[PDB]
């Protein structure tokens, strides 16, 4: 069982800069290592194989090196198209892939605008209750949402979804939805979503009472 | 030609 | 130009079989080894199988060996993946890929990939979404901006499409990726931020179209007095 670990998990850069990516193997794979680029909603593209060889038509600005358990891809003169996910792959023992490194566009910090939405009367009438917490147009991508029901921290009853980085402003938006049965929802009074983010000096909490808004 | 796998290792014949 | 064309995606019930195909053009297919590789956001890329120059020369990942069969028909330039005894865990994007195939002495690297076929393994029935408003309020406006939206809940299979005001409102719209619920149904939200002053005097309608069920909804979203 051979594992490949990529780092950094995320790299924030600007067009024209240089990116340095690393792939580490659990045990030696000699030079049996390749690198792929995958743009959102597209097929992977082979960049480098046998650790340092460029695939046909691949520009020299993609440069691979390393051996044994330690490998590096550098990408010089980043292009708009290069902001994508990069994967390593070994063929020393069967075939496995790293988990990827995400390359995104750097911009200034922007705190999210936070909105909470109680479940509609219609939904409740249907027997379930979804409370939606929206974090709008923020940067960087990392943000945390903590639900509190009557001040008690919650776990396991929510799902989160994040947009792709926005073309226009390079920001992200995020939805976190707390789902409860109608009775369970009706059993508690205060609903709150508490947000933390780099652009926020202290957590932002938006809340409402059951039956109100 | 032929592709050989021997306990995970790849070879060509 | 080199081309790998994959069969279209769709749904299949657990326990059943499904054969995917991939047809090559623009190169001499017979001279290349071929692979199937799948991808999920949760588990990443997973190699599944290789077939080499000779159509009887094949290998498989431990995970699918004896369940999946790879094959090739050189006269039709087609690569097949026959998947049997499918489980929900086989839900993934399935790529065919060409091996570098000894060009410049290298092998077992994927030098060209198809666009992928999305396979959904699920026992869920086709179901249209329930659409619920996410109402704005003057209480909830932040810095002169209000947020409103629609929650598109409990549909199958993917995808749904959402527009606002029939496509007339695009600025400030964010439609989130769907999430699969423990029920086997999908849910997503679509939101838009608008000037807080336009709440009373501007109509906001979310148009939801679920083509897999051929289902349409127009839902007017109105402010609440909080
Ligand atoms: K095998
Ligand atoms: Na599904």
Q: Which two tokens stand for residue A118?
A: 């109680």
* Full domain range(s) for residue A178: 108-213
Helix (H) or strand (E) holding A125: helix A121-126
CA distances from C24 to A38, A81, B9, C32 (A): 21, 26, 28, 10
Cβ contact (<8 Å) for B3 and C102? no
Q: Measure Cα distances from A86 to A104, A161, C7, C167 in Å.
A: 11, 22, 26, 34
Give the distance from residue B8's alpha carbon to the nearest chain A alpha carbon, in angstroms. Answer: 5
C135 and C75: one domain?
no
For chain B, the 3-state helix, strand and coil shares in percent, each to the nearest 5, are 0, 60, 40
CA distances in angstroms from A152 to A148, A190, A196, C184, C189, listed in the order given: 5, 10, 17, 29, 26
Q: Coil, strand or helix: which one is C71?
A: strand
C86, burial (CB in 10 Å: exposed 0-12, middle 13-18, buried 19+) = buried
Cβ atoms C22, C7 nearer than 8 A: yes
Structure tokens at A162: 């994040």
Could you tell me which of C80, B5, C196, C176 has the C-alpha nearest to residue A174?
Answer: C176
Task: Classify each residue of C94-116 as buried b or exposed e, where b means 16 or more C-beta atoms within 10 Å of its C-beta.
Answer: bbbbbbbbeeeebbbbbbbbbeb
Answer for the pair A147, A193: CB distance below 8 angstroms, yes or no: yes
Place of tokens 């508490």: A194
Resolution stated for this PDB structure, in Å: 1.8
CB within 8 Å: A213 and C189 = no
Please state how this structure was obtained: X-ray
Q: Which chains touch B (3 or more CB pairs under 8 A)?
A: A, C
| Shared-domain flag, residues A50 and A22 | yes
Give the number of domains in chain C.
2
Query: A110: which DSSP letter?
Result: B
CA distance A207 to A117: 9
Rounded distance between C-alpha atoms, residue C166 and residue C204, angstroms: 10
User: Distances in Å between the alpha carbon of A31 and those of A48, A68, A88?
Assistant: 11, 7, 12
Look up residue C149 and give its two tokens: 């939206």
In a shared domain, residues A99 and A126: no
Of C65, C90, C123, the one marking the end of a domain is: C123
CA of C41 from ligand 2 middle (Å) equals 14
Shortest CA distance to C170 belongs to which of A80, A104, A166?
A166
Category of C88 on φ-ψ map: left (φ > 0), alpha (ψ -120 to 50) or beta:
alpha
Rounded CA-CA distance A104/A196 in Å is: 21
B5 vs A contacts (CB less than 8 Å) = 94
Cβ neighbours for C200, distance < 8 A, ≥ 6 positions apart: C223
Q: Which residue of C has its CA nearest to A39?
A: C115
Q: Is C186 exposed, middle or buried, given 0-12, 13-18 or 19+ CB atoms closer than 10 A? A: buried
Is residue C9 domain-shared with residue C114, that is, in the same domain?
A: yes
d(CA C68, ligand 1 centre) in Å: 10
Spatial CB neighbours of C214, under 8 Å, sequence gap ≥ 6? none
Which residue of chain C has the CA closest to B10? C108
C110 is in which domain, residue-wise? Answer: 1-123
Give the tokens for residue A141: 């991508």
Alpha-carbon gap, residue C185 to A84, rounded angstroms: 29
Contact with chain C for residue B3, Cβ under 8 A: yes
Please indicate if any CB of chain B lies within 8 Å of the CB of A14. no
* Number of domains within chain A: 2
- Same domain, yes or no: A45 and A137: no
Tell me the shortest Cα–Cα distance from C28 to chain B, in angstroms. Answer: 16
Cis ω for the linkage preceding A8 (within 30 of 0): yes
A41 and A91 in a single domain? The answer is: yes
CA-CA distance, C47 to B10, in Å (whole number)?
14
CATH number at residue A139: 2.60.40.10
Residues C108 and C150 in one domain: no
Which ligand is located closest to the Cα atom of residue C14?
2
Statement to judge: residues A147 and A60 lie in one domain: no
Interface of A with B in 54-93 (CB under 8 A): 91-93
Chain B CB contacts of C59 under 8 Å are 3, 5
């Amino acid at each position: 069982e051979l594992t490949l670990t990529q780092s950094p998990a995320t790299l924030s850069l600007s067009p024209g800069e240089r990116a340095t990516l690393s792939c580490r193997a659990s045990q030696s794979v000699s030079s049996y290592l390749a690198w792929y680029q995958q743009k959102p909603g597209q097929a992977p593209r082979l960049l480098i194989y046998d650790a340092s060889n460029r695939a046909t038509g691949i520009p020299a600005r993609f440069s691979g090196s390393g051996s044994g358990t330690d490998f590096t891809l550098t990408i010089s003169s980043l292009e708009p198209e290069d902001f994508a996910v990069y994967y390593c792959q070994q063929r020393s023992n069967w075939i496995t892939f790293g988990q990827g490194t995400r390359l995104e566009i750097k911009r200034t910090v922007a705190a999210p605008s936070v909105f909470i939405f109680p479940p509609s009367d219609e939904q409740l009438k249907s027997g379930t209750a979804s409370v939606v917490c929206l974090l709008n147009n923020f940067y960087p991508r990392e943000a945390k949402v903590q639900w509190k029901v009557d001040n008690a921290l919650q776990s396991g009853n929510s799902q989160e979804s994040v947009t792709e980085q926005d073309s226009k402003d390079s920001t992200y938006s995020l939805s976190n939805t707390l789902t409860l049965s109608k009775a369970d929802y009706e059993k508690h009074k205060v609903y709150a979503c508490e947000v933390t983010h780099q652009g926020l000096s202290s957590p932002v909490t938006k809340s409402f009472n059951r039956g109100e808004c | 030609r032929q592709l050989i796998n021997t306990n995970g290792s790849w070879h060509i014949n | 130009e080199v081309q790998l064309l994959e069969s279209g995606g769709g749904v299949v019930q657990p326990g059943r079989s499904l054969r995917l195909s991939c047809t090559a053009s623009g190169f001499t297919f017979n001279n290349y080894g071929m692979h199937w590789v799948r991808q999920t956001p949760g588990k990443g890329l997973e190699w599944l199988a290789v077939i080499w120059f000779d159509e009887n020369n094949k290998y498989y990942a431990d995970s699918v060996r004896g369940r999946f069969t790879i094959s090739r028909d050189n006269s039709k330039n087609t690569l097949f993946l026959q998947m049997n005894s499918l489980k929900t865990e086989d839900t993934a994007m399935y790529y065919c890929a060409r091996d570098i195939s000894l060009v410049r002495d290298a092998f077992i690297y994927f030098d060209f990939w198809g666009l992928g076929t999305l396979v959904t393994v699920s026992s869920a029935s086709t179901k249209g979404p329930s659409v619920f408003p996410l109402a704005p309020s003057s209480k909830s406006t932040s810095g002169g901006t209000a947020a409103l939206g629609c929650l598109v809940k409990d549909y199958f299979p993917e995808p749904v499409t959402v527009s606002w005001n029939s496509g007339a409102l695009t600025s400030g719209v964010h439609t989130f990726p769907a999430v699969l619920q423990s029920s086997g149904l999908y849910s997503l939200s679509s939101v838009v931020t608008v000037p807080s002053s336009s709440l009373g005097t501007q109509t906001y309608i979310c148009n939801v179209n679920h083509k897999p069920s051929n289902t349409k909804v127009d839902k007017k979203v109105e402010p609440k007095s909080c």
